[PDB]
Design a protein around this ligand. Structure first.
Ligand SMILES: COc1cc2cc(OC)c1OCCOC[C@H](C)OC(=O)[C@@H]1CCCCN1C(=O)[C@H]2C1CCCCC1
Length: 128
């Protein structure tokens, strides 16, 4: 399923080309502007440990997740991945620890050296 499909078929969107962040577009977005660093961005997401063992959704708060792009208010993989997305796009991200919580992890939610999977829909972005 989705994590393995990203491993096998994802595009490497890292500058380093170390496969730290792999992407597949699931549904195409509208127009051709992606957000610029500093933009306030609005998403829905479903996430989990690649293990499948914990799971997490914006829908659980019943409202979109908002943050400011590339100001590291989210993991590096999100600052990277979301920057590549067009409005209304849905993407799958598979993320090595180096672009998430690293060998330190973030307990109790995230263990050491965890690979994370997300499905992300980009709803909108505004130039804060
Ligand atoms: C480690 O702490 C959490 C992780 C996540 C959800 C949490 O609560 C909703 C959470 O505690 C609140 C702090 O948030 C941390 C940052 C902002 O989170 C992110 O960078 C990323 C990407 C943006 C959405 C949340 N992300 C997460 O890593 C989730 C995580 C939970 C377990 C399954 C894998 C995803």
């Amino acid at each position: 399923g989705a994590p393995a499909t990203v491993t096998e078929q994802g595009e490497d969107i890292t500058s380093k080309k170390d496969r730290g962040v792999l992407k597949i577009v699931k549904r195409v977005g509208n127009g051709e502007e992606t957000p610029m660093i500093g933009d306030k961005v609005y998403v829905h997401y479903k996430g989990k440990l690649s293990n499948g063992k914990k799971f997490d959704s914006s829908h659980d708060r019943n409202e979109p997740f908002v943050f400011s792009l590339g100001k590291g208010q989210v993991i590096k993989a999100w600052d990277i991945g979301v920057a590549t997305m067009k409005k209304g796009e849905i993407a799958h991200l598979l993320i090595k620890p180096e672009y998430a919580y690293g060998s330190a992890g973030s307990l109790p939610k995230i263990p050491s050296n965890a690979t994370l999977f997300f499905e992300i829909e980009l709803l909108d972005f505004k130039g804060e």
